[PDB]
């Protein structure tokens, strides 16, 4: 994995990629790491797998019986914190998950939590989570500013995705956008790898590490 | 988590036309060494059904505690205990399956490799295996320990395959089982001279044979053979 | 030790080093440069474990000043960097291998061409672009991928190279104190005292 | 730490009709991070070609130590070495390393310019002759590489059509594998003319 | 590996499987395990395969140039002594399990040989992963006084006992028959038992499916 | 120490059609280097038109089989003798097991059928839960060999329109019964020749909204 | 391994079992561990196969190069040598050797060899995995000055125990008649001696 | 986590507390508050492992302010530093302990004093002028032995603690991103957002 | 330990050494390892001396509350009382234990319980540490039916070749004479049994 999110002037981007592993085994190249928990809410997946599928389609159910109970959606503070508290009662028994718990509300504003299997919960700005947060940290930071554009934005996030998918090992398939804004999360599409880097390349002149 | 101290070696079986048959050597090991050999590994269930044992013998005896109260659990209010609701082969192994699988799973198994030899009630072939681990599988062959590796390969040159088993008569397959307790009695180092021979046939019933010994043996060219 | 970094651009070769020399829980000195001058038109940065680094670099620029004064001859960047590759090789295999990587920096007068060479202490050599050692390129080759071309002049070079450090002393765990920065071309070796 | 999966990479080569070909990825990582994409592992002495994969660093030192030995074999045989006596030079200076040795997967492959018949053979790291009439496999996507060769794989195939076929058993095997990729290059080989072709393939 | 040695009339025979296995990939589906330490004394090889065949090799050679040196023809006994003691002195680390035979002055023999460096004396052996499969059957179909028809037949059946019934043993069957007095006769796939069945698809793609980046003519001449 | 996990080696593959949908896997069974069965199935019928395949510890593989079987019977008793869909069998199978997670079940799940949509469906899961929906998949110890052939073959990856400079990729379209059948067992061959664990006899389950109808195939028994 | 040699009124004799095995599987089950290092002093081997093998072979090099230059040499010189290969070499071999010869002089003598390299002259001496079983029953039976025929007795009951209890011991019993006379090998099947 | 250190002066409490959140080879956080406010007039820092930290905080937070509510009254911070200890002292011998160190600062409105304790994960209480967890008391502790006195005011406490930042910054190997400085007194908890 | 249970015409004799050893020191040279769980059903303790105890005392508590209840038990049944502890608890102990009794109906009987906590019922039984010096002897001279005398003197001449050989194993041979007649307590000391 590689997941990333940050906050700016026009909401939230939200980035990942497609790539499961079984070692040096590439398992899939076409999977969903993005949970849409609701209109307003999403959830990132990086380090195990059904670690990370299976608790996070719980945290939607938990999520989906408070705004039964208190007839409200909740905050984007008290989803992630559940998901917080439940691997924290699981701390040291070997869960691996690296999260990121992305939405608007009115009360918040657009929101960025990280969650993590050790019971670290952090509000931030930006953040990336997986094996090659690294990468995308490289690509992202050195271009980010509050200021963005919301088309500028989003191909930032692609394009750090693509930098991780590129030179991390453990990352790769396609890349899978989101944008969240007032009105809710809205999905940009899903942009294969094979055809991403070439177009990027040739219309960016970038990876010139590569033979063209 | 156990070690197992009182071991008993192969047990081999092969179908045949009309039913089955199954074998065990009557050795007690204890390590290398050869402690009792007045054992019977071969455990009959009413008139239809061998289970044959291999591994540790605590472990065995438990098992045919098992089976005994099984056959007693039947006969309770059941009219139809020695008719249509006997019990069958499929039901007596099923039930030592699940045992040994939830033993394994508790981390407290079984240590024994176990073959339910006999004949259904509509006359069908019933062979099938099952281990510590609660590993389960069936073939016209069957073997556990060293009878895996050196019976099984005898069985098969004469039942190969499915459509092998009604060209195989009682005859030739009662001799391809005493042939191969023979060779393992050649090259098995926990085995013993002695063993006990089970048919289950669906015609003839079940036939028990005890006290069998390995005959017919080559040693002579032995004499011939000088230092290395 | 820890980070150093190499950039070749269109006439020259750029090599960023760590001035940090850590032990323990005391940062001993914030002033270190962790390279060696090899030949005019050569210069080689090293990282890895205590001793072993110093040890080893000064022992190739010993045996390529006996080479130059015998030769009275600049060997080049490739000559020089195979013999350091073949140098790690038998290393690897040693009873006390040199646990060092380096970056040589060179630029080929015959040619006319700067070149960068990483090593790893496997003796593992690749000609490159950019390169790195240990956790720095975990950040900087994503990074370069992105900003580096192939026709970019010194000053866009260095302003690249900045662009390096600053995401590394953003993200990296510890303070490496800054770094020293040395530039080889046509005309040889400078540092870059204002970084 | 295990020696040959930490750069990664993989070969394979194939006969067809009066020709033979051997292609190659361009990786060469540490562990997850991908260091270069322009790292060749096929080399050639020659007309008899060699592909080697595993441990970089001994890559490169097998290459330079046959390099040296075949020059000389030259120099002293007034002859180009065949590919059937390269292929037991190779084993013999891999066996002479019996108890530290190079950790590598070797691939010969070349037609005989006497006879004119097509010649591939592989080895394992300790000098053991893997001869074979199809195809020889090597790396961290060998496993990858043994399914598409034994399936895509037939006899007779002429110089333009074994070029698709080698190249997709590569292409596919090393899509599958995370050390394995990063670009590929084949060479087809005739008996007086030799092709060499970059694949392009998804850069992940 | 599986290998076996039997033993008949007027010589020996020896046969082995062609299967060569990685982990649990087959590495080689039609290996040649029988090897050739003199003209009329061949070795069956199991264990770790380059072990079996370089210290077939490095006797053989030397046995060559023993018999140059000697002016007589090399006997098996010669052999067994100079692999033993080989192996011996280095412990079990090199891996070779071998079964020694052959015809010479003296007559027709059958030895095996372990990794550790010990031998034995038999009428009919058997070494490898598929060792058990075999020698049941050698143990169930071998006696006294065989013919030479008769002994191919047996040591043919005790390696496909191997080929069927062991993982590590596999596609066809090689024989080498060293009989006294005439040429010893090496039977390279004397058995094919397991021909690939013809697919069920041609999967020739259509040329220029593969997309291509560059295209260059290498330079092999000077 | 007593270790609770085993090997039971084979491979299983599921290929997803328009109408139908196919579950393949081989018939043998092994531990070790020793052949336990020539036929034992490992693909079952769990009704609903689910077919089913949990390849790698046999024990555990039937024991979640089983208790599959069980989950359907009891879907039925508990909501009105309602169909059990085919992704809703793939959610509960999740939580079958996850519930293992720190013992697990040390099995590649397959399930395959139709969905709502009458369309061909293949699910496929790792040892502790995880799922994804693909056309295509291929598990067990053969997996490595099978699946990038799968890939280029099913879904055409790395295969571009000839003659359009790799700008053109070649289009998805699903593949007949027919074809797809012809698929299945060329992979089944190739990895029966270079996986020791593989072979014996291939069985297909093929579902289509007609029901489920089975083939049989032969494989080397080497 | 059951091996064992028993001195008598006419010389020594020594005795063995025949079962080699690997693990639980008998690699051979004909083997002959009674071994020839000169014309009438010969060695039970027990232990490592290949360790006691080698030393045999350097032993039997040893008294041939002996014989060239000093004659015949004793039983008591052929055990020392034994001796000097398994003390000097303890850490890296694992042989159990006994030694018995036949002079005219000193008649039949028996020397026992342990792991350690300690040598021990005895009037008869029994090793291997299976010589556990039967000290009770050859120190209640053995007796001085015996014939041979009843020597004979004396290890064919003696080896028929060891091979019963011992799994590691079984096959044929085989044995080795040192006298003035000659050398003389005898063997005896199972159909024979399982049922004394 | 990693830095936490307080002085305590003539009329107040400062705590300092590093902003840095790091996990393997990246900072994921430069602006992290590690301390929690129990009651009105006492504030608790903290550090140790990843998420014990925060939880063992604002399980503490929760029952200092469950007891104000029921007796309408605030704890004094020798009260509440006992209660602390005891949570820990328990914790050490269960199945999982909680593996943090805090430091309570705090001002005692009956005595009219300011109160500084440092307590471990092992329940190891102490009251202090000044205190450090982890490597930072390997520098602190001297200087502050040096340049403290106990009559010193707020600002004197400031550029004492200003002191010993630099120090950190100069000779600590990790980058820890600066620290969050806040003051308690007879007015309460404020924070010095310029630092 | 070297103990022993040999059944005979007018029914049962149990025996043993008397040495009890912490490593090579001998804590205890005059134990008594033959065990009363009751009247006429006695038994051997080898292995563990606190397990063997501690399951003793169980058996015996389980036997006097059975006879308060159902009368006499059987032999069989205090065998199988026996295994049940030694089975269900195989993982936390380490007892071999000979069981045997006399019954009126069933004359002598003896029951061996192993490591595992199997059961064996056998004409007579051998175990501890220095019975397997005795396999041979043992079965080269048990016979069935053998009179008071003759098995004592069996038993004698057994226990005094387990004792000769094994270290573990010495003191004064104790035996229990199980019959009709009653319970008869027998000794035999050093000067006795090493010199036969
Ligand atoms: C990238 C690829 C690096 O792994 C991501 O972290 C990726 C995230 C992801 C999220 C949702 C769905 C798919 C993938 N993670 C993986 O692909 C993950 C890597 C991983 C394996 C094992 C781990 O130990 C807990 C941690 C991370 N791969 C898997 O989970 C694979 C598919 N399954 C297994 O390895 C099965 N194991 C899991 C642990 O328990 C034993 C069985
Ligand atoms: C059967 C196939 C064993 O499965 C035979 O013993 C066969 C013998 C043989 C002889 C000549 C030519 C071909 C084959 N042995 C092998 O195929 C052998 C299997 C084996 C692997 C590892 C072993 O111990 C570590 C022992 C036996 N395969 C190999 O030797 C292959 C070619 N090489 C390796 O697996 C790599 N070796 C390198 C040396 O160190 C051990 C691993
Ligand atoms: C009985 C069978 C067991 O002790 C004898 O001692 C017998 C003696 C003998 C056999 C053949 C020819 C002459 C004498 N010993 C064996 O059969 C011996 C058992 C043994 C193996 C290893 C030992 O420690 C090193 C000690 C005893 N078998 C072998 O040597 C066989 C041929 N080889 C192996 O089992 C391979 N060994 C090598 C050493 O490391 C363990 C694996
Ligand atoms: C002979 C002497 C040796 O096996 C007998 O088995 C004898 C039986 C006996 C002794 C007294 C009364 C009735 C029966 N056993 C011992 O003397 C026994 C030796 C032994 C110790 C530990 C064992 O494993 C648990 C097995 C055998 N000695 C003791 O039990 C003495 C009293 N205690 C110790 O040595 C202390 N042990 C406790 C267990 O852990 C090791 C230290
Ligand atoms: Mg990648
Ligand atoms: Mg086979
Ligand atoms: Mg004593």
Request: one cysteine or more.
């Amino acid at each position: 994995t590689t997941t990333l999110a940050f906050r700016f002037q026009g909401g939230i981007i939200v980035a990942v990629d497609s790539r499961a592993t079984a070692g040096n085994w590439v398992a899939s190249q076409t999977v969903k790491k993005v949970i849409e928990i609701n209109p307003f809410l999403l959830g990132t997946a990086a380090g195990g797998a059904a670690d990370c599928q299976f608790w996070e389609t719980w945290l939607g159910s938990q999520c989906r019986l408070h705004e039964l109970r208190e007839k409200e959606r909740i905050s984007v503070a008290a989803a992630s914190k559940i998901l917080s508290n439940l691997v924290y009662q699981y701390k040291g028994a070997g869960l691996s998950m690296g999260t990121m718990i992305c939405g608007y509300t009115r009360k918040e504003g657009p929101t960025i939590y990280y969650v993590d299997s050790d019971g670290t919960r952090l509000k931030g700005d930006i953040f990336c989570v997986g094996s090659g947060q690294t990468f995308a940290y490289g690509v992202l930071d050195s271009n980010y500013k509050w200021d963005l554009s919301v088309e500028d934005a989003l191909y930032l996030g692609k394009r750090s995705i693509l930098a991780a998918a590129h030179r991390d090992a453990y990352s790769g398939g396609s890349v899978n956008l989101y944008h969240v804004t007032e009105d809710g999360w809205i999905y940009h599409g899903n942009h294969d790898v094979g055809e991403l880097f070439w177009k990027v390349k040739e219309e960016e002149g970038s990876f010139n590490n590569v033979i063209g | 988590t156990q070690q197992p101290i009182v071991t008993g070696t192969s047990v081999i079986s092969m179908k045949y036309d009309n039913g089955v048959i199954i074998a065990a050597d009557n050795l007690g090991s204890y390590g290398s060494l050869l402690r009792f050999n007045g054992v019977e590994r071969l455990i009959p269930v009413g008139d239809n059904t061998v289970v044959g044992i291999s591994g540790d013998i605590s472990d065995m005896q438990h098992i045919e505690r098992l089976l005994k109260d099984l056959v007693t659990e039947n006969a309770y209010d059941n009219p139809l205990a020695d008719a249509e609701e006997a019990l069958e082969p499929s039901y007596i192994f099923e039930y030592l399956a699940t045992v040994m699988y939830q033993r394994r799973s508790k981390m407290n198994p079984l240590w024994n490799a176990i073959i339910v030899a006999g004949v259904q009630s509509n006359g069908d072939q019933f062979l099938r295996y099952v281990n510590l681990l609660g590993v389960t599988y069936s073939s016209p062959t069957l073997a556990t320990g060293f009878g895996a590796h050196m019976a099984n390969p005898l069985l098969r040159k004469v039942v190969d395959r499915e459509s092998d088993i009604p060209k195989t008569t009682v005859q030739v397959a009662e001799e391809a089982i005493v042939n191969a307790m023979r060779v393992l009695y050649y090259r098995d180092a926990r085995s013993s001279r002695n063993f006990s021979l089970a048919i289950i046939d669906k015609n003839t019933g079940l036939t028990f044979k005890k006290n069998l010994q390995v005959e017919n043996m080559k040693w002579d060219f032995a004499k011939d053979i000088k230092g290395y | 030790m820890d980070i150093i970094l190499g950039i070749r651009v269109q006439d020259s070769v750029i090599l960023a080093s760590s001035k940090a020399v850590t032990r323990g829980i005391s940062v001993l000195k914030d002033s270190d440069d962790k390279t060696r001058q090899l030949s005019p038109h050569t210069l080689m940065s090293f990282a890895g474990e205590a001793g072993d680094t110093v040890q080893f670099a000064e022992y190739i620029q010993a045996n390529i000043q006996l080479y130059s004064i015998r030769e009275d001859y600049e060997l080049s960047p490739q000559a020089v960097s195979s013999f350091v590759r073949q140098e790690l090789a038998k290393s690897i295999r040693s009873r006390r291998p040199y646990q060092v990587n380096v970056l040589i920096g060179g630029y080929d007068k015959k040619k006319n061409k700067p070149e960068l060479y990483q090593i790893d202490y496997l003796g593992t050599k690749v000609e490159l672009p950019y390169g790195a050692h240990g956790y720095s390129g975990f950040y900087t080759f994503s990074l370069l991928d992105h900003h580096y071309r192939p026709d970019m002049t010194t000053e866009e070079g260095l302003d690249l190279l900045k662009l390096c450090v600053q995401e590394l002393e953003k993200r990296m765990p510890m303070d490496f104190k800054g770094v020293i920065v040395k530039i080889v071309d046509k005309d040889g070796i400078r540092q870059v005292d204002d970084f | 730490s295990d020696p040959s999966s930490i750069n990664g990479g993989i070969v394979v080569a194939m006969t067809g009709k009066d020709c033979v070909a051997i292609a190659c990825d361009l990786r060469l990582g540490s562990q997850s991070l991908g260091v270069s994409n322009k790292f060749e592992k096929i080399f050639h002495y020659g007309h008899v070609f060699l592909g080697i994969t595993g441990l970089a660093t001994d890559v490169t030192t097998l290459n330079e130590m046959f390099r040296y030995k075949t020059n000389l074999y030259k120099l002293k045989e007034e002859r180009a070495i065949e590919p059937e006596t390269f292929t037991q030079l190779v084993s013999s200076s891999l066996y002479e390393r019996r108890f530290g040795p190079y950790f590598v997967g070797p691939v010969v492959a070349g037609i005989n310019s006497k006879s004119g018949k097509p010649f591939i053979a592989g080895f394992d790291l300790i000098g053991c002759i893997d001869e074979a009439k199809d195809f020889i496999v090597s790396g961290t996507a060998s496993d990858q590489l043994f399914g598409m060769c034994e399936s895509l794989y037939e006899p007779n195939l002429e110089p333009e059509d074994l070029f698709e076929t080698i190249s997709q058993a590569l292409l596919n095997a090393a899509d599958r594998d995370a050390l394995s990729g990063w670009g590929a290059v084949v060479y087809i080989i005739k008996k007086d003319e030799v092709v060499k072709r970059y694949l392009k393939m998804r850069q992940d | 590996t599986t290998i076996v040695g039997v033993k008949f009339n007027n010589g020996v025979v020896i046969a082995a499987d062609t299967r060569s296995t990685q982990g649990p990939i087959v590495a080689d589906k039609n290996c040649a395990k029988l090897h050739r330490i003199s003209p009329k004394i061949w070795c069956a090889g199991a264990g770790t395969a380059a072990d079996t065949e370089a210290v077939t090799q490095l006797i053989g050679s030397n046995i060559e140039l023993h018999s140059l040196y000697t002016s007589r023809e090399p006997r098996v006994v010669s052999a067994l002594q100079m692999l033993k003691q080989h192996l011996f002195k280095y412990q079990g680390h090199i891996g070779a399990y071998l079964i020694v035979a052959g015809v010479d002055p003296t007559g027709s023999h059958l030895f095996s040989i372990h990794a550790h460096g010990s031998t034995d004396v038999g009428y009919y052996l058997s070494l490898g992963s598929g060792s058990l499969a075999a020698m049941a059957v050698l143990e169930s179909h071998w006696k006294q006084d065989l013919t030479k028809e008769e002994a191919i037949k047996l040591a043919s059946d005790a390696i496909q006992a191997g080929i069927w019934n062991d993982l590590g043993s596999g596609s066809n069957v090689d024989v080498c028959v060293m009989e006294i007095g005439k040429d010893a006769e090496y039977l390279r796939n004397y058995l094919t038992p397991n021909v690939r069945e013809e697919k069920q698809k041609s999967y020739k793609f259509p040329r220029g499916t593969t997309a291509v980046l560059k295209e260059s003519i290498v330079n092999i001449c000077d | 120490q007593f270790n609770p996990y085993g090997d039971n080696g084979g491979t299983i593959l599921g290929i997803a059609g328009e109408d139908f949908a196919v579950l393949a896997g081989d018939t043998r069974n092994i531990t070790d280097y020793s052949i336990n069965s020539r036929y034992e199935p490992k693909v079952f019928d769990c009704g609903d038109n689910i077919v089913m395949s949990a390849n790698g510890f046999a024990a555990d593989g039937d024991a979640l089989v089983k208790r599959f079987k069980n989950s359907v019977k009891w879907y039925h008793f508990d909501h009105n003798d309602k169909k059990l869909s085919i992704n809703s069998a793939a959610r509960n199978i999740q939580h079958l097991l996850y519930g293992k997670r720190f013992f697990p079940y040390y099995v590649h799940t397959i399930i395959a059928g139709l969905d709502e949509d009458g369309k061909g469906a293949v699910y496929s899961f790792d040892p502790v839960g995880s799922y994804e929906r693909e056309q295509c998949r291929a598990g067990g110890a053969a997996a490595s060999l099978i699946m990038p052939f799968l890939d280029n073959q099913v879904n055409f990856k790395n295969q571009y329109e000839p003659g359009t400079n790799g700008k053109v990729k070649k289009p998805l379209k699903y593949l007949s019964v027919e074809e797809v059948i012809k698929l299945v067992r060329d992979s089944f061959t190739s990895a029966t020749e270079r996986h020791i664990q593989v072979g014996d006899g291939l069985e297909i389950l093929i579902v289509t909204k007609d029901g489920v109808r089975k083939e049989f195939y032969e494989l080397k028994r080497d | 391994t059951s091996i064992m040699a028993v001195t008598f009124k006419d010389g020594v004799i020594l005795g063995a079992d025949s079962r080699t095995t690997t693990g639980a599987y008998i690699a051979n089950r004909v083997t002959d561990k009674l071994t020839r290092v000169h014309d009438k002093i010969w060695c039970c081997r027990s232990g490592s196969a290949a360790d006691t093998q080698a030393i045999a072979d350097i032993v039997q090099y040893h008294l041939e190069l002996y014989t060239s230059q000093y004659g015949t040499p004793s039983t008591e010189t052929a055990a020392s040598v034994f001796k000097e290969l398994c003390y000097e070499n303890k850490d890296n071999l694992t042989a159990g050797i006994i030694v018995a010869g036949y002079d005219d002089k000193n008649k039949g003598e028996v020397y026992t060899i342990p792991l350690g390299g300690s040598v021990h002259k005895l009037p008869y001496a029994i090793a291997g995995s299976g010589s556990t079983f039967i000290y009770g029953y050859c120190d209640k039976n053995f007796r001085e000055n015996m014939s041979k025929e009843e020597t004979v007795d004396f290890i064919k009951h003696s080896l028929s125990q060891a091979i019963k209890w011992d799994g590691s011991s079984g096959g044929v019993i085989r044995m080795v008649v040192l006298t003035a006379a000659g050398v003389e090998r005898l063997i005896f099947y199972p159909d024979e001696y399982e049922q004394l």
